Design a protein around this ligand. Structure first.
Ligand SMILES: C[C@H](N)C(=O)NS(=O)(=O)OC[C@H]1O[C@@H](n2cnc3c(N)ncnc32)[C@H](O)[C@@H]1O
Ligand SMILES: [Zn+2]
Ligand SMILES: [Zn+2]
Length: 739
C-alpha cells in the first residue's frame, strides 16, 4: 500500500465531508470539507488570519491549554505520562528529543519494550535546531517547544486504534476548541525521524500548521523500500499512531497575538525590548500597526531569503504605508528580540536537563545556543544577563529541573567570559582573513566557528564591514547543528566468527567470585577457544578482560585475552590449543579479577559521589576504552577545586566504609526505568527486553560487569589525578584498594 493510497484508506475524511484536492498551493494533495473554495494551505498563498482575530473559543494560557489537552485525552482512555528530558538519555542514536515519539524509540517502537500506557497522552518539550534559522522570523518557529500528543501502539492482531480514530480525535479536539471542520485542512506529507516514518496529515487552521498526524508503519532499514528525505524505510510488523500538537501554536491561535513569542513569553520579549537599543516603543499605535500587518505575512516571507522575501518585503511595505527601510527598522530588530527570547528558553531546558557546554557531543549544541544568545544580547546591547532571562522563563513555565538555577547562572557566567575572549581576538582574526581572501565561503564561516568559536553572524558582518564578498548561508546554524545532532560513527565494530555457535553461558553475571568452572570446548577458531559456558569476563562494559587458563586431560592452556562475538565468548590462547570437544576446568586469575572488581565497583561509588558534590549536571562523559589506568570521565563545566576533590574522595570513602550492599538482577526495561530513572544509562544504553541492573550503594546502573558484594570490599579510594581532557569533560584517575 503506497503512501498515496494510504490516505484513500481513511473513511473518516470522506464520511465527514472532506474531499481530496490539489490546488496546487504548495503542490501537494490536501483534504478540505469546505465546498466553497480550494486555494487552501499554509506556506504560499494563505497567511495568518487569526492575528487580531483568535480562531479558538477562548484565549488559553500555556499551562491551561496544556492541561486542557491532557485532560481531553485522559477522559478518552489515554493514560497521562510525565515529560522526558530534552536530552535523549534513553537512546544513543540522537542527542536531543526532536519529537514526542522520540521518547519511545527505538525500544518501544520496535516492540522490544511496552509503552508507559496504551494509549498514552503527553506534553513533550522538544528541541528542533534545524528550525534555528527561521526562529524569530516566521512568527511560528521555536527551537524548544512542547509537542502534545496521543500515542497508540499497535501490534499484529492487537490494535488500540488507527488512522480513522486518529484523524477523528484531532477533528473533535479542534471542533471543541472553536474550529469547525470546514476550517480544518489536512495536507498530505510524509514524516520521518528517529528511525521511523509513515504517511501523515498536517492539521492546518488559520494559515498555520498546528498539529501533525503520522500513521507510523515504516522503520529505517538498510534494505529500505520507501525513500524519505535521504533515508530508506521498510514496512514494520508493528504500526503506531504518532501525533504531535504544538502547545505554543495552539495558545497562539487562541490569543491571536502577532507572533507565537508574544503568546507564550510576552514578559521576556517586553523586558528584552525595554532593556535594549530598540529604536521603537512597545506602546506606539504606529509601531503596533506595522508589526500586526507584517506579522500576518511572517509565515510567507519568513520562509524566504535573498530576492525571494525581498519582494514580499515590498508588498507589505506598500500596504502598510512607510517604506521598506522603515519596515526593516522594526522587523529586523524584533527578529532578534524574538530569537533571544526563544533561545534563552531553550537554554533553560538544555541546562536544566543536564547538558554541559563543550566542543563535542550534545554539549556542543548547548554551547552553540549560548554563544548565539550572547551574540544577540550584544547586538541589542541587552541591559540584563542571559541568566536573568532564563530565570524569567523558569518562573513563567513553573517547571522543575534536575539542575538548579544556581548552577545555570554559574555556567552562563563562565560561557560569557569565554565568549568575551573569543570575540576580542576574533574580530582581528576575521579582519585579517578579509585582507587575505576577500571572499568568505560557507566552509570558511564553518571553520571559524568550530576552530575559534566565532559566531557566524559576527564573522559575516565584519567581512561585509570591510567590503568583502560574503553572504549569510542558508541554515548555517542548522548545518553546524546538523553536523552535531547525533552520535558519531564509532568504528569499534563487530567480529564475525566463520561458524555459528550457541550464545556462551556467561557465568560471571550471578557470581563475581566464581573463579573456577567446568566447561567443554565447543569450537576453536585461530586463537579463539570457545566453550559452552565460562566465567571469563570479556573485555567490555567498563572493566578490562580476565586472565587465566583452562586445565584438562592435556595440561594447562593459558588464556591471555578474551573478546566476544555476538554472544559467543572468545578465549585467546596461542600455540598449544585444546581439541574441540575436550572437557576443561577453567581457572581465572584471582588478582586480575579482584582488581577489576574493586575499581569497577569504585567507578559506581565515584560517579555517585561526583553527582552529590558537584551537581546533577554530572553525567559519565563516556568510556572510550583504554584501561591502562582506572579512569572516569564526567561532564563538568570547570576544574574541580582542591576542596571539592577532597570532598569527592571523602564522600566516596564514607560510602565504602558504610559497607552498603551491592545487588544485581535482570529486570524488564520499563520496570527499571520506572524505578530508577534514566540515570540507569550513564554507561550507555544496552539492548534487550530485560537488562541487568546493578546497585552499588545508592547508585543504580544497567551494567554487565563484575562487582564486589558490598562497598566495603572496594577498599579505600584515592583520586590520583584530575584532568581537563576537553571543555566540559573532567577525567578522574583513581586507585581502589591498592597503589
Ligand atoms: C508527529 C511527528 N513526529 C511530528 O513531529 N510532527 S511535526 O514535526 O510537525 O511536529 C508536530 C507539531 O509540533 C509543532 N512544531 C514543530 N516544530 C516546531 C517549531 N520549530 N516551533 C514551534 N512549533 C513546532 C507544530 O505544531 C507541529 O505541527
Ligand atoms: Zn584559524
Ligand atoms: Zn558496573
Amino acid at each position: 500500500m503506497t503512501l498515496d493510497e494510504e490516505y484513500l484508506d481513511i473513511t473518516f475524511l470522506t464520511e465527514n465531508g472532506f474531499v481530496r484536492k490539489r490546488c496546487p498551493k504548495c503542490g501537494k494533495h490536501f483534504w478540505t470539507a469546505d465546498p466553497e473554495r480550494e486555494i487552501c494551505g499554509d506556506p504560499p498563498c494563505e497567511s495568518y488570519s487569526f492575528i487580531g482575530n483568535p480562531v479558538f473559543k477562548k484565549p488559553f494560557e500555556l499551562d491551561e491549554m496544556r492541561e486542557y489537552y491532557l485532560n481531553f485525552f485522559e477522559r478518552r482512555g489515554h493514560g497521562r505520562i510525565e515529560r522526558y528530558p530534552v536530552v535523549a538519555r534513553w537512546r544513543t542514536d540522537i542527542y536531543l528529543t526532536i519529537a514526542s515519539i522520540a521518547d519511545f524509540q527505538p525500544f518501544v517502537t520496535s516492540g522490544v519494550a511496552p509503552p508507559p500506557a496504551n494509549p498514552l497522552t503527553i506534553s513533550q518539550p522538544c528541541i528542533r535546531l534545524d528550525d534555528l534559522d527561521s526562529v524569530g522570523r516566521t512568527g511560528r518557529h521555536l527551537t524548544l517547544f512542547e509537542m502534545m500528543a496521543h500515542h497508540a501502539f499497535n501490534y499484529p492482531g492487537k490494535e488500540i486504534y488507527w488512522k480513522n480514530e486518529t484523524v477523528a480525535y484531532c477533528t473533535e479536539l479542534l471542533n471543541e476548541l472553536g474550529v469547525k471542520k470546514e476550517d480544518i485542512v489536512y495536507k498530505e506529507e510524509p514524516w520521518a525521524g528517529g528511525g521511523n516514518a509513515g504517511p501523515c496529515l498536517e492539521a492546518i487552521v488559520g494559515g498555520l500548521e498546528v498539529a501533525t498526524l503520522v500513521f507510523m508503519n515504516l522503520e529505517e532499514h538498510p534494505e529500505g523500500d520507501i525513500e524519505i528525505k535521504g533515508a530508506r524505510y521498510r514496512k514494520m510488523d508493528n504500526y503506531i499512531v504518532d501525533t504531535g500538537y504544538g502547545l505554543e501554536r495552539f495558545v497562539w491561535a487562541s490569543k491571536g497575538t502577532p507572533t507565537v513569542y508574544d503568546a507564550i513569553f510576552p514578559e521576556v520579549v517586553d523586558t528584552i525590548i525595554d532593556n535594549s537599543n530598540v529604536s521603537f516603543n512597545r506602546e506606539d499605535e504606529r509601531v503596533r500597526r506595522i508589526v500586526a500587518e507584517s506579522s500576518k505575512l511572517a509565515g510567507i516571507m519568513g520562509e524566504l531569503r535573498g530576492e525571494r522575501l525581498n519582494q514580499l518585503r515590498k508588498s507589505v511595505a506598500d500596504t502598510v504605508g512607510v517604506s521598506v527601510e522603515e519596515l526593516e527598522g522594526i522587523v529586523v530588530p524584533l527578529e532578534k528580540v524574538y530569537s533571544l527570547a526563544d533561545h534563552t528558553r531553550c537554554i533553560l531546558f538544555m541546562l536544566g536537563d543536564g547538558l554541559v557546554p563543550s566542543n563535542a557531543g550534545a554539549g556542543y549544541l548547548a554551547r552553540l545556543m549560548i554563544r548565539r544568545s550572547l551574540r544577540l544580547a550584544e547586538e541589542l546591547e541587552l541591559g540584563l544577563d542571559l541568566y536573568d532571562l532564563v530565570e524569567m522563563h523558569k518562573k513563567i513555565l513553573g517547571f522543575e529541573f534536575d539542575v538548579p538555577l544556581s548552577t545555570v547562572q554559574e555556567i552562563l557566567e563562565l560561557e560569557k567570559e569565554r565568549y568575551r575572549t573569543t570575540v576580542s581576538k576574533g574580530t582581528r582574526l576575521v579582519e585579517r582573513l578579509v585582507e587575505r581572501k576577500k571572499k568568505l565561503e560557507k566552509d570558511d564561516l564553518i571553520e571559524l566557528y568550530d576552530s575559534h568559536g566565532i559566531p557566524v553572524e559576527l564573522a559575516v558582518g565584519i567581512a561585509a564591514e570591510k567590503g568583502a564578498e560574503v553572504e549569510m548561508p542558508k541554515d548555517i546554524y542548522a548545518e553546524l547543528a546538523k553536523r552535531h545532532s547525533k552520535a558519531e560513527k564509532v568504528q569499534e565494530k563487530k567480529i564475525t566468527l566463520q561458524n555459528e555457535y550457541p550464545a556462551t553461558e556467561k557465568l560471571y553475571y550471578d557470581d563475581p567470585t566464581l573463579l573456577e568452572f567446568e566447561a567443554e570446548v565447543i569450537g576453536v577458531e585461530g586463537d579463539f577457544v570457545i566453550l559452552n559456558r565460562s566465567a571469563f569476563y570479556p573485555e567490555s562494559g567498563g572493566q578490562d578482560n580476565d586472565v587465566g587458563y583452562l586445565i584438562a586431560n592435556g595440561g594447562k592452556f593459558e588464556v591471555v585475552d578474551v573478546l566476544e562475538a555476538d554472544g559467543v565468548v572468545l578465549h585467546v590462547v596461542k600455540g598449544a590449543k585444546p581439541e574441540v570437544g575436550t572437557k576443561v576446568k577453567g581457572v581465572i586469575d584471582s588478582d586480575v579479577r579482584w582488581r577489576h572488581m574493586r575499581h569497577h565497583s569504585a567507578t559506581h561509588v565515584l560517579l555517585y559521589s561526583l553527582q552529590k558534590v558537584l551537581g546533577n549536571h554530572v553525567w559519565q562523559a563516556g568510556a572510550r576504552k583504554e584501561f591502562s589506568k582506572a579512569r572516569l570521565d564526567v561532564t563538568h563545566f570547570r576544574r574541580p577545586s582542591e576542596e571539592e576533590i577532597k570532598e569527592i574522595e571523602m564522600l566516596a570513602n564514607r560510602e565504602i566504609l558504610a559497607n552498603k550492599p551491592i545487588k544485581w538482577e535482570w529486570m524488564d526495561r520499563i520496570e527499571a526505568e520506572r524505578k530508577f530513572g534514566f540515570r540507569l544509562y550513564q554507561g550507555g544504553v544496552p539492548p534487550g527486553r530485560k537488562i541487568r541492573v546493578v546497585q552499588v550503594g545508592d547508585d543504580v546502573q544497567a551494567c554487565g560487569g563484575t562487582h564486589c558484594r558490598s562497598t566495603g570490599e572496594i577498599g579505600m579510594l584515592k583520586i590520583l589525578k584530575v584532568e581537563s581532557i576537553q571543555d566540559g569533560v573532567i577525567r578522574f584517575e583513581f586507585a581502589a584498594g591498592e597503589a
